[PDB]
């Protein structure tokens, strides 16, 4: 289904439309994604045991 036909279909019947937004919209909201969270956790974990400066 081409995007334009989808837009026309949605506009035709927009009064009955659930939305489903999981972890994909948050990427563009200025908040870290799943991969960013994973990398942050890895950063804390590595800096903690192997004593390394966090902000360096």
């Amino acid at each position: 289904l081409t995007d334009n036909e989808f837009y026309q279909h949605y506009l035709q019947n927009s009064q009955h439309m659930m939305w489903f937004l999981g972890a994909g919209t948050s990427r563009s909201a200025g908040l870290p994604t799943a991969s960013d969270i994973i990398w942050d956790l890895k950063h804390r974990y590595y800096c903690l045991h192997e004593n390394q400066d966090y902000q360096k």
Binding site: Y46, E50, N51, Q52, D53, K56
Partner: protein, 456 residues
């Protein structure tokens, strides 16, 4: 009580190639992707000249000619990949030298071969190559050939022929790749061809490979020494080396003397702070003037109390100094059990005590072997049956075995002069040793710092 601290196996470091296509195995990556500097086209075409006695001239042509043809390995086939020639593998044409560039060793050298005078032979060879001083732009790499008949002056007490020749030629700024009968003799042709091809490409100015995802803000210093057997006492020649990565894409590798007389290999406060300040200025010059956020120092012997303070007083607070001593001779040795059919994995480091760890720089590596795919490869299976773990003694690092262990493991893979998978020591240590030999042979080098491409 038979329980030791949990060992951690550092993964095999990756090497950077053309179009930043990473690979652990250097020669295979060179075949598949090409040299790292191929994208920059820094060497362009490679133009090389000869300097040998005419009675062996043809030999040089032959090997150079055979540099331009494919070769299939017969020895160490478990590791070496099929050679494709300089034109194909390095994406660079190999230029046949013209008669104007080609030189002949002056006749009196042969005569002094009978006299057994190494200094005279080296000076005569330099004067033979003096015909190439004016035509420095025409050629990039010189191929000096020393016949087996000169073996009497090859090595003797207090003198090293290749060392003296390179020490004489380096201030003139023209690389040589000395070729002896060994390179011709050697059965497996692909081994020697990989060696000479990589050596020539790197001596021209290109970079065959670089450490993948290497930090540009860390400089890895390495200090070594050499013995000169003086008539009255001993002489210790200490020289340093740096393998940092500048803000550009290429990476640097420069050694220099630490200097008037030393009877012990331990740098004092003044000398150590001076060499470290020179190293700091060298690093600053490349990175526009930015401080190195972390400094690694690999010394073959332990750091003195004054020497540690000398290392500290040379840098600011932001710099992190991890003084490390590398020990090659240890009573420990490891056996891998799951009893593994292949020796203990390379990079497996075992923390023995606070500020003392065992690193297995030597060992089996996964996925590198070509024949029988999916099996470990032991590079030194010919010499030793089992690997010998080196030992790190920490002196200054605040914390973390991973930083030093991974840094050293990755550093043992960027020796272009080496045509095998890795080394026993980081390139800093081996190049500091080589330059220590060079300086010990020739005292009039202490003033200037030199790149790795000259003495490699």
């Amino acid at each position: 009580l038979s329980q030791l601290a949990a060992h951690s196996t550092i993964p095999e470091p990756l090497l950077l190639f053309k179009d930043n296509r990473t690979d652990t195995h250097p020669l295979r990556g060179l075949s598949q992707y090409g040299p790292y500097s191929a994208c920059f086209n820094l060497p362009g075409q490679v133009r090389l000249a000869y300097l040998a006695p005419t009675e062996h001239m043809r030999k040089l042509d032959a090997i150079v000619r055979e540099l331009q043809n494919p070769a299939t390995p017969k020895e160490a086939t478990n590791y070496y990949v099929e050679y494709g020639g300089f034109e194909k593998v390095f994406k660079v044409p190999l230029v046949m030298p013209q008669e104007h560039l080609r030189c002949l060793a002056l006749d009196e050298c042969h005569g002094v071969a009978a006299n057994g005078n190494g200094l005279a032979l080296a000076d005569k060879i330099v004067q033979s190559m003096s015909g190439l001083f004016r035509q420095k732009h025409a050629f990039d790499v010189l191929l000096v050939y020393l016949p087996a008949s000169w073996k009497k002056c090859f090595e003797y007490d207090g003198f090293d022929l290749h060392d003296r020749i390179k020490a004489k030629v380096a201030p003139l700024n023209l690389p040589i790749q000395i070729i002896n009968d060994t390179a011709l003799t050697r059965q497996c042709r692909a081994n020697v061809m990989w060696g000479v091809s990589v050596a020539l490409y790197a001596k021209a100015g290109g970079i065959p490979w670089k450490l993948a995802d290497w930090d540009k803000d860390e400089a890895y210093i390495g200090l070594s020494y050499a013995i000169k057997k003086n008539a009255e006492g001993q002489e210790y020649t200490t020289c340093c080396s740096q393998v940092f990565d500048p803000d550009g894409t290429g990476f640097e590798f420069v050694a220099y003397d630490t200097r008037d007389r030393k009877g012990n290999p331990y740098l004092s406060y003044q000398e150590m702070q001076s060499v470290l300040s020179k190293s700091l200025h060298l690093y600053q010059s490349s990175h526009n003037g930015r401080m190195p956020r972390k400094i690694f120092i690999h010394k073959t012997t332990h750091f003195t109390e004054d020497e540690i303070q000398g290392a500290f007083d040379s840098f600011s607070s932001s710099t992190e100094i991890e003084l490390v001593q590398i020990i090659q001779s240890t009573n420990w040795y490891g056996l891998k059990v799951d009893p593994a059919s292949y020796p203990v994995d390379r990079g497996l480091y075992q923390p023995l005590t606070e500020s003392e760890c065992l690193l297995w720089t030597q060992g089996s590596v996964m996925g590198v072997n070509q024949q029988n795919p999916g099996q470990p490869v032991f590079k030194e299976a010919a010499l030793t049956p089992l690997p010998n773990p080196i030992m790190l003694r920490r002196f200054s690092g605040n914390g973390g075995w991973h930083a030093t262990c991974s840094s050293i493991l990755a550093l043992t893979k960027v020796d272009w002069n080496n045509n095998t998978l890795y080394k026993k020591l980081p390139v800093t240590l081996v190049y500091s040793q080589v330059f220590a030999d060079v300086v010990k042979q020739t005292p009039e080098i202490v003033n200037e710092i030199y790149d790795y491409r000259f003495f490699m």
